[PDB]
Amino acid sequence: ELAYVRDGVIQFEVQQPMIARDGPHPVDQPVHNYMVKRIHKRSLSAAF
């Protein structure tokens, strides 16, 4: 499936766990870090 993609993009979500709770830190909202990357098209041509 590459005839028509219109430079599609994808999204991924990754968490950052450190350790289980053991007392009043106090807890807060965790950071929802994410990364976005684009695709690249490459082709090889020759003469024969």
């Binding site: 090889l44 020759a46 024969f48």
Partner: protein, 68 residues
Amino acid sequence: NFTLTQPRAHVDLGVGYTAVCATAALRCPLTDMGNTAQNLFFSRGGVPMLHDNVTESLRRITASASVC
């Protein structure tokens, strides 16, 4: 005649800021050195003066691929 083309695509997996690079070896240097000369005479000249004849005679009698 025909041309073989394979239009494909690729995507990355990890971040590009986590890698280690270092030098392994280098070629042995070998260049001309020692009794070298500059190209000042061939690189045009400068302000002329009344000593043009004597200076050109001196240049002629002294005159009789890496530069420095």
